[PDB]
Amino acid sequence: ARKGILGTKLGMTQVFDENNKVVPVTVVKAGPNVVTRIRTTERDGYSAVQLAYGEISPRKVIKPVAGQFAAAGVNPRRHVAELRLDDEAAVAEYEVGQELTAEIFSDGAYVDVTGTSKGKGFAGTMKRHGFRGQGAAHGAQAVHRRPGSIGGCATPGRVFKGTRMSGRMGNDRVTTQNLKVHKVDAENGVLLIKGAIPGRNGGLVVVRSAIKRG
Template structure:
């Protein structure tokens, strides 16, 4: 929970926070770590379409295609989308609407996708770019 400068007097170190802090907030940003998918190919990781299934292609149907030119430039450019580890990244989902604040059970009901696994730890903060939905 971020406390603005000059407003520290109302908070104590180690104080327990409840969802009642979100009573006046209509939109929030949720930050979490996305689910890890392990090693993923180009089709799953970047949405590549792949090659043809027929016409002489026996093992190229899920291949990414060409990764560069020939002698000039003679290298692969940086940032080329290739296969690799997918997921397990810090993700921010913006402008999620707060449906209800249940102070009795200390539950915050949010409409939309929340990154990470069930029972995962997330950061919920006031929406930075709040707009009407």
């Protein structure tokens, strides 16, 4: 029903079309993934599949985590995350210890990507929320770039909780929707995303079958 798989961004490039065009493509290394858990509604309250990825030496992994992996029946992995299903028909095909690779996706189908946006730092109001600066001339008095007025006076005499102003951006989960997959492989699990996805080089991204059009 709904497919998904984890991946890693290493670069971002372009590839050529059969319609003779050129399309930018994001390198996504969807390395091999192993099923470490199954979630059943009667025993837990929902249906989902938990996946682990990466290679970590057995001594760098925390001992309870290593024990949990041994109980699951697979060697230790780097990061762990789950994919949520919606019916037990898709649940029944997944079993503990099963291995998933990138060929499960067929080219021509939209995909959705989820990752952590870049760490931009504590930024000003105008850069963050796209405000407009005032004149840097005509007698400005050191308020060149700072927002200014916030609300009424003595009624309500406050700020309107939720007002858009200064704060740190980035370093949070961000999703991009309805993306081309241009080309997939079977050899070493490399998946291609036409466009630009959020995250970092050598960062963590998860790709899921598109909900919008699929």
